[PDB]
Amino acid sequence: MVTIKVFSPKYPTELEEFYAERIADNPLGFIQRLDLLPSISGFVQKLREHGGEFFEMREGNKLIGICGLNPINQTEAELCKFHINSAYQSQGLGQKLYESVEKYAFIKGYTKISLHVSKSQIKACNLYQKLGFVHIKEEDCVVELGEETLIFPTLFMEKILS
Numbered sequence: 001m002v003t004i005k006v007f008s009p010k011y012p013t014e015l016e017e018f019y020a021e022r023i024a025d026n027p028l029g030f031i032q033r034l035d036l037l038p039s040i041s042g043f044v045q046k047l048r049e050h051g052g053e054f055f056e057m058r059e060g061n062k063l064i065g066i067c068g069l070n071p072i073n074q075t076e077a078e079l080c081k082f083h084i085n086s087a088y089q090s091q092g093l094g095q096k097l098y099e100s101v102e103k104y105a106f107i108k109g110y111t112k113i114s115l116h117v118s119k120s121q122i123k124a125c126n127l128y129q130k131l132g133f134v135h136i137k138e139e140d141c142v143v144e145l146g147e148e149t150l151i152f153p154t155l156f157m158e159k160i161l162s
């Protein structure tokens with residue numbers, strides 16, 4: 001039995017452990033040195049302090065999915081931290097999790113959802129196309145992190161809700 005609600009940790013480091021595993025499972029598309037960035041729990045707090053929200057998906061009490069919503073302005077919000085556990089992918093759960101976040105954004109008053117994603121993330125790019133997102137631009141995003149300089153081929157997308 002699968003449930004979606006606002007995220008609440010079952011134990012203190014649950015989000016950190018789930019996130020690190022999702023990030024390590026996607027080596028081509030994400031910054032891997034999570035120790036050099038603020039914790040995912042601080043990210044959630046930043047979202048909520050600016051009017052955003054962070055959501056969970058659980059099978060029983062087992063976390064299997066996460067998704068964030070970050071406001072840009074009065075009418076535009078950004079999807080972020082969209083992840084489903086490997087064993088539960090490709091069954092329709094991610095689409096259902098997205099549809100919950102979109103409905104929540106629509107009720108809050110957002111009329112546009114934007115996002116960016118690495119081109120290596122094939123499943124996500126197919127889903128966003130299925131959901132009706134439209135490409136804005138492609139770009140090789142340069143990120144300097146510590147003693148490294150990383151290059152991510154990235155897609156930017158928008159969807160109008162109303």
Ligand SMILES: CC(=O)SCCNC(=O)CCNC(=O)[C@H](O)C(C)(C)COP(=O)(O)OP(=O)(O)OC[C@H]1O[C@@H](n2cnc3c(N)ncnc32)[C@H](O)[C@@H]1OP(=O)(O)O
Pocket residue numbers: 026029079080081082083084085088089090091092093094095096115116117118121122123124126127130
């Ligand atoms: C804004 C951001 O956060 S960008 C970061 C996005 N996150 C990632 O890339 C992390 C890695 N991927 C994932 O965690 C997940 O696959 C998600 C969250 C992107 C998608 O959730 P899933 O459970 O896999 O998706 P779901 O089962 O609902 O599939 C929906 C659509 O995704 C696409 N898709 C899913 N699985 C596959 C697959 N194996 N091959 C190709 N396309 C696929 C299809 O378009 C599918 O629609 P369909 O079933 O009608 O053909």
